[PDB]
Short mmCIF file of N, CA and C in Angstrom, two decimals:
data_model
loop_
_atom_site.label_atom_id
_atom_site.label_comp_id
_atom_site.label_asym_id
_atom_site.label_seq_id
_atom_site.Cartn_x
_atom_site.Cartn_y
_atom_site.Cartn_z
N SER X 4 28.79 33.64 14.62
CA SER X 4 28.65 34.97 15.65
C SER X 4 27.67 36.66 14.52
N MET X 5 27.21 37.37 14.98
CA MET X 5 26.53 39.02 13.90
C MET X 5 27.73 39.45 13.44
N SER X 6 28.22 39.80 12.70
CA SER X 6 29.56 40.44 12.31
C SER X 6 30.71 39.32 11.65
N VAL X 7 30.49 38.11 12.03
CA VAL X 7 31.56 37.40 11.93
C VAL X 7 31.13 36.22 11.29
N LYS X 8 31.81 36.18 10.64
CA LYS X 8 31.39 35.04 9.48
C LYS X 8 32.49 34.88 8.70
N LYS X 9 32.49 33.58 8.62
CA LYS X 9 33.65 32.40 6.98
C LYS X 9 33.30 33.10 6.36
N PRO X 10 34.55 32.62 5.27
CA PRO X 10 35.04 32.98 4.46
C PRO X 10 33.16 32.16 3.53
N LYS X 11 32.92 32.84 2.08
CA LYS X 11 31.88 32.73 1.30
C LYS X 11 31.83 31.26 0.42
N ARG X 12 31.40 29.99 0.94
CA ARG X 12 31.25 28.85 -0.45
C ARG X 12 30.76 29.39 -1.41
N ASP X 13 31.12 28.97 -2.57
CA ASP X 13 30.33 29.37 -3.80
C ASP X 13 29.25 28.38 -4.53
N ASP X 14 28.15 28.78 -4.29
CA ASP X 14 27.05 27.92 -4.03
C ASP X 14 25.91 28.14 -5.30
N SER X 15 26.61 28.74 -5.60
CA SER X 15 25.69 29.47 -7.44
C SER X 15 25.25 28.36 -8.97
N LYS X 16 26.65 27.31 -8.19
CA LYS X 16 26.18 26.41 -9.11
C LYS X 16 25.90 24.32 -8.72
N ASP X 17 25.21 25.12 -7.40
CA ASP X 17 24.62 23.67 -6.38
C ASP X 17 23.38 23.40 -7.71
N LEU X 18 22.48 23.63 -7.99
CA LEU X 18 20.98 23.11 -8.18
C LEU X 18 21.74 22.63 -9.54
N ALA X 19 22.49 23.16 -10.41
CA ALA X 19 22.59 22.75 -11.70
C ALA X 19 23.55 21.25 -11.24
N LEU X 20 24.34 21.42 -10.64
CA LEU X 20 25.15 19.99 -10.56
C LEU X 20 23.92 18.90 -9.47
N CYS X 21 23.54 19.58 -8.67
CA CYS X 21 22.47 18.46 -7.89
C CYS X 21 21.51 17.33 -9.36
N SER X 22 21.15 18.60 -10.19
CA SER X 22 20.18 18.21 -11.33
C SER X 22 20.95 17.34 -12.23
N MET X 23 21.78 17.55 -12.62
CA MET X 23 23.18 16.58 -13.39
C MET X 23 23.51 15.01 -12.59
N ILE X 24 23.44 14.99 -11.30
CA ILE X 24 23.51 13.63 -10.18
C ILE X 24 22.17 13.42 -10.73
N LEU X 25 21.24 14.16 -9.92
CA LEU X 25 19.77 13.32 -10.34
C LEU X 25 19.44 12.33 -11.79
N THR X 26 20.24 13.33 -12.95
CA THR X 26 19.84 12.67 -13.99
C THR X 26 21.06 11.47 -14.19
N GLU X 27 21.78 11.58 -13.81
CA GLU X 27 22.30 9.71 -13.76
C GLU X 27 22.00 9.13 -12.73
N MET X 28 21.35 9.31 -11.73
CA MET X 28 20.98 8.21 -10.87
C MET X 28 19.53 7.99 -11.60
N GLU X 29 18.60 9.02 -11.99
CA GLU X 29 17.54 9.01 -13.14
C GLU X 29 18.12 7.32 -14.44
N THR X 30 19.01 7.31 -14.40
CA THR X 30 19.05 6.76 -15.82
C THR X 30 20.12 4.90 -15.78
N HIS X 31 20.76 4.59 -14.22
CA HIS X 31 20.32 3.95 -14.05
C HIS X 31 19.96 2.45 -14.16
N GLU X 32 20.39 1.66 -15.00
CA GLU X 32 19.63 0.68 -14.90
C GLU X 32 18.96 -0.17 -13.79
N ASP X 33 19.61 0.22 -12.93
CA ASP X 33 18.67 -0.83 -11.24
C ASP X 33 17.93 1.05 -10.52
N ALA X 34 17.11 1.82 -11.26
CA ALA X 34 16.47 2.49 -11.12
C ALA X 34 15.43 2.28 -11.19
N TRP X 35 14.96 1.42 -11.60
CA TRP X 35 13.50 1.10 -12.08
C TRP X 35 12.23 0.91 -10.05
N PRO X 36 12.74 0.56 -9.16
CA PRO X 36 11.93 0.82 -7.96
C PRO X 36 11.70 1.86 -8.01
N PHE X 37 12.75 3.12 -8.16
CA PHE X 37 12.45 4.44 -7.19
C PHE X 37 12.17 4.92 -8.43
N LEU X 38 11.99 4.80 -9.89
CA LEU X 38 11.84 5.64 -10.29
C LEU X 38 9.99 6.96 -10.45
N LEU X 39 8.68 6.34 -10.04
CA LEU X 39 7.78 6.03 -9.38
C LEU X 39 7.44 6.26 -7.92
N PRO X 40 6.43 7.42 -7.69
CA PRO X 40 5.82 6.62 -5.61
C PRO X 40 5.76 5.13 -5.91
N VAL X 41 5.96 5.17 -4.71
CA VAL X 41 4.95 3.44 -4.31
C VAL X 41 3.74 3.85 -4.58
N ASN X 42 2.58 2.59 -5.13
CA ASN X 42 1.56 2.82 -5.64
C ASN X 42 0.46 2.58 -3.98
N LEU X 43 0.00 3.35 -3.24
CA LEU X 43 -0.14 2.98 -1.83
C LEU X 43 -1.29 2.47 -2.43
N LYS X 44 -2.31 2.26 -3.06
CA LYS X 44 -3.52 1.69 -2.71
C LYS X 44 -2.74 -0.12 -3.12
N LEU X 45 -2.60 -0.36 -3.88
CA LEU X 45 -1.85 -1.53 -4.62
C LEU X 45 -0.54 -1.72 -3.51
N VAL X 46 0.03 -1.53 -2.82
CA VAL X 46 1.41 -2.52 -1.71
C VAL X 46 0.95 -2.95 -0.41
N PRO X 47 0.21 -3.94 0.19
CA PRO X 47 -0.05 -3.74 0.80
C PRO X 47 0.80 -3.38 2.23
N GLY X 48 0.81 -2.95 3.20
CA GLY X 48 1.29 -2.27 4.11
C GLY X 48 2.51 -0.80 4.31
N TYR X 49 2.17 -0.28 2.85
CA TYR X 49 3.38 0.13 2.61
C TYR X 49 3.10 1.64 3.36
N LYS X 50 1.87 2.67 3.51
CA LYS X 50 0.80 3.41 3.54
C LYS X 50 1.28 3.36 5.33
N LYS X 51 0.68 2.31 6.18
CA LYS X 51 1.15 2.47 7.49
C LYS X 51 2.59 2.60 8.07
N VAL X 52 3.41 1.75 7.54
CA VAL X 52 4.65 1.64 7.75
C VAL X 52 5.24 2.80 7.31
N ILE X 53 5.88 2.92 5.54
CA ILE X 53 6.56 4.30 5.15
C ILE X 53 6.22 6.34 5.55
N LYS X 54 6.75 6.66 6.35
CA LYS X 54 5.65 7.41 7.14
C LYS X 54 5.97 8.95 6.32
N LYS X 55 7.21 8.68 5.28
CA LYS X 55 7.83 9.88 4.13
C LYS X 55 8.28 9.21 3.43
N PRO X 56 7.36 8.98 2.75
CA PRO X 56 7.82 7.67 0.97
C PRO X 56 8.15 9.20 0.01
N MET X 57 8.78 8.27 -0.52
CA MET X 57 9.83 9.26 -1.84
C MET X 57 10.75 9.01 -2.39
N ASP X 58 10.49 9.10 -4.04
CA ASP X 58 11.30 8.89 -5.21
C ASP X 58 11.92 9.95 -5.97
N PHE X 59 11.99 9.11 -6.86
CA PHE X 59 13.11 10.06 -8.19
C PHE X 59 12.26 11.26 -8.78
N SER X 60 10.72 10.71 -8.96
CA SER X 60 10.11 12.00 -9.35
C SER X 60 9.41 13.25 -9.23
N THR X 61 9.72 12.65 -7.45
CA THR X 61 8.79 13.77 -6.47
C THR X 61 10.38 14.32 -6.35
N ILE X 62 11.46 13.84 -6.50
CA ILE X 62 12.81 14.87 -6.02
C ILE X 62 12.93 15.44 -7.24
N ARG X 63 12.68 15.24 -8.23
CA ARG X 63 12.50 15.79 -9.46
C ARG X 63 12.04 17.23 -9.33
N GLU X 64 10.53 16.92 -9.07
CA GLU X 64 10.13 17.65 -9.22
C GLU X 64 9.88 18.93 -8.31
N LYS X 65 10.57 18.78 -7.11
CA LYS X 65 10.43 19.76 -5.75
C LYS X 65 11.54 20.42 -5.87
N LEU X 66 12.31 19.37 -7.16
CA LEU X 66 14.37 20.61 -7.38
C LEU X 66 13.99 21.75 -8.03
N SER X 67 13.08 21.14 -9.49
CA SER X 67 12.27 21.72 -10.51
C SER X 67 11.49 23.22 -9.95
N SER X 68 10.68 22.93 -9.26
CA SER X 68 10.29 24.08 -8.05
C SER X 68 11.15 24.53 -7.22
N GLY X 69 12.04 25.01 -7.29
CA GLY X 69 12.51 25.54 -5.70
C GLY X 69 12.07 25.12 -4.91
N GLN X 70 11.74 24.36 -4.06
CA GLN X 70 11.63 23.55 -3.18
C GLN X 70 12.80 23.20 -2.42
N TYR X 71 13.90 22.64 -2.87
CA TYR X 71 15.34 22.45 -1.76
C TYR X 71 15.71 24.11 -1.60
N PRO X 72 15.77 24.38 -0.18
CA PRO X 72 16.34 25.55 0.34
C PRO X 72 18.40 25.45 0.29
N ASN X 73 18.66 23.82 0.38
CA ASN X 73 20.26 24.13 0.00
C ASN X 73 20.76 22.60 -0.55
N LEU X 74 21.33 22.46 -0.73
CA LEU X 74 21.86 20.72 -1.16
C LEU X 74 22.05 19.89 -0.13
N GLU X 75 22.39 19.93 1.31
CA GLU X 75 21.64 19.22 2.19
C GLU X 75 20.35 18.67 2.49
N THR X 76 19.40 19.68 2.27
CA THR X 76 17.96 19.13 2.06
C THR X 76 17.66 18.07 0.39
N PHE X 77 18.37 18.14 -0.24
CA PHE X 77 18.38 17.55 -1.43
C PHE X 77 19.32 15.83 -1.16
N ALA X 78 20.40 16.16 -0.73
CA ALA X 78 20.85 14.60 -0.02
C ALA X 78 19.94 13.98 1.16
N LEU X 79 19.04 14.90 1.73
CA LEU X 79 18.65 13.91 2.69
C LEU X 79 17.40 13.10 2.17
N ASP X 80 16.71 13.64 0.59
CA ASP X 80 15.66 13.31 0.42
C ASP X 80 16.26 11.94 -0.60
N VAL X 81 17.19 12.20 -1.38
CA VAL X 81 17.99 11.17 -2.00
C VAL X 81 18.08 9.57 -1.32
N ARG X 82 19.11 10.00 0.26
CA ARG X 82 18.69 8.88 1.37
C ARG X 82 17.98 8.49 2.07
N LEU X 83 16.47 9.19 1.91
CA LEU X 83 15.35 9.19 2.07
C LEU X 83 14.32 7.98 1.70
N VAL X 84 14.92 7.71 -0.09
CA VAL X 84 14.26 6.66 -0.42
C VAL X 84 14.98 5.42 -0.55
N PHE X 85 16.28 5.81 -0.35
CA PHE X 85 17.08 3.99 -0.14
C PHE X 85 17.09 3.54 1.89
N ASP X 86 16.73 4.27 2.49
CA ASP X 86 16.35 4.14 3.32
C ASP X 86 14.94 3.73 4.16
N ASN X 87 13.77 4.45 3.73
CA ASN X 87 13.10 3.89 3.02
C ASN X 87 12.69 2.20 2.46
N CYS X 88 13.70 2.21 1.41
CA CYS X 88 13.82 0.67 0.30
C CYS X 88 14.58 0.11 1.43
N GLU X 89 15.43 0.20 2.43
CA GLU X 89 15.88 -1.48 3.34
C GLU X 89 15.37 -1.26 4.33
N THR X 90 13.54 -0.32 4.40
CA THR X 90 13.05 -0.55 5.63
C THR X 90 11.91 -1.81 5.57
N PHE X 91 11.47 -1.69 4.35
CA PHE X 91 10.80 -2.13 3.50
C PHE X 91 11.35 -3.89 2.22
N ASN X 92 11.91 -4.19 2.30
CA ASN X 92 12.35 -5.23 1.28
C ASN X 92 13.55 -5.85 1.96
N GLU X 93 13.81 -7.30 2.00
CA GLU X 93 14.68 -7.50 2.10
C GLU X 93 15.96 -7.40 1.81
N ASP X 94 16.81 -7.62 1.95
CA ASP X 94 18.70 -7.83 1.27
C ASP X 94 19.12 -8.43 0.61
N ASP X 95 18.45 -9.61 0.47
CA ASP X 95 18.55 -10.31 -0.83
C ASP X 95 16.96 -10.74 -1.50
N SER X 96 17.02 -9.50 -2.19
CA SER X 96 15.92 -9.36 -2.93
C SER X 96 16.43 -8.52 -4.10
N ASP X 97 14.89 -8.67 -5.16
CA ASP X 97 16.06 -8.22 -6.20
C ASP X 97 16.00 -6.06 -6.37
N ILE X 98 15.35 -5.65 -5.70
CA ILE X 98 15.24 -4.42 -4.85
C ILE X 98 15.96 -3.70 -4.39
N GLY X 99 15.34 -4.56 -2.52
CA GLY X 99 16.76 -5.04 -1.91
C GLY X 99 18.26 -4.51 -2.63
N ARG X 100 18.48 -5.17 -3.18
CA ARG X 100 20.10 -5.23 -3.78
C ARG X 100 19.98 -4.08 -4.77
N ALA X 101 18.98 -3.63 -5.96
CA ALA X 101 19.24 -1.99 -6.54
C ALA X 101 19.02 -1.33 -5.63
N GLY X 102 18.86 -1.33 -4.08
CA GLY X 102 19.15 0.13 -3.61
C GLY X 102 20.20 0.44 -2.89
N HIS X 103 20.80 -1.14 -2.58
CA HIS X 103 22.05 -0.52 -2.21
C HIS X 103 23.30 -0.13 -2.97
N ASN X 104 23.01 -0.58 -4.20
CA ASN X 104 24.26 -0.17 -4.97
C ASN X 104 23.65 1.49 -5.74
N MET X 105 22.04 1.75 -5.51
CA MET X 105 21.79 2.80 -5.68
C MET X 105 22.44 4.35 -4.92
N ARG X 106 22.53 3.43 -4.15
CA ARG X 106 22.67 4.66 -2.90
C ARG X 106 24.25 4.95 -2.64
N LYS X 107 25.65 3.20 -3.22
CA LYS X 107 26.78 2.93 -3.35
C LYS X 107 26.34 4.44 -4.32
N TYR X 108 26.35 4.36 -6.01
CA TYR X 108 26.33 4.75 -6.83
C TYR X 108 26.38 6.75 -6.47
N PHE X 109 25.26 6.89 -5.56
CA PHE X 109 24.67 8.23 -5.59
C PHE X 109 26.56 8.96 -4.29
N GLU X 110 26.28 8.48 -2.97
CA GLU X 110 27.42 8.93 -2.32
C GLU X 110 28.64 9.04 -3.10
N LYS X 111 29.62 8.50 -4.10
CA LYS X 111 30.67 8.31 -4.51
C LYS X 111 30.35 10.55 -5.59
N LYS X 112 29.31 9.97 -6.19
CA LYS X 112 28.99 11.43 -6.58
C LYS X 112 28.94 12.48 -5.84
N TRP X 113 28.32 12.00 -4.87
CA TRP X 113 27.94 13.53 -4.20
C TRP X 113 29.53 13.32 -3.65
N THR X 114 29.99 12.54 -3.61
CA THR X 114 32.15 13.50 -2.55
C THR X 114 32.53 13.53 -3.55
N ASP X 115 32.43 13.22 -4.68
CA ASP X 115 33.40 13.48 -6.05
C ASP X 115 32.81 14.87 -7.27
N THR X 116 31.23 15.32 -6.49
CA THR X 116 31.25 16.60 -6.98
C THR X 116 30.82 18.04 -5.82
N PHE X 117 31.32 17.72 -4.88
CA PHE X 117 31.40 18.72 -3.25
C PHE X 117 32.10 18.35 -2.76
N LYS X 118 32.71 17.07 -2.17
CA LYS X 118 33.97 16.77 -0.80
C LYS X 118 35.38 17.47 -1.58
#
């Protein structure tokens, strides 16, 4: 509350560390469904169904331009990429399986870097 604060957690390396995680997600062999925005002219149903599209290149541009206020808003966009994928793709599909693999990969790196 006013003039009463918890001890200050050092957040000065968060930007660099989220960039490194994003680099590792970018270079994973199963990243290919997630590298670029879904083409809304060429994929029937996507525009109407997925209310907030997200992808790795859009996260990278947001990160690089100071559009993430803190490390939690960055994790929310990464998780959005996987939630969108589960909404649109069957579990038993190459893209469906890709999304589950990448989410697992991300959550481990997130815990090990920050928790």
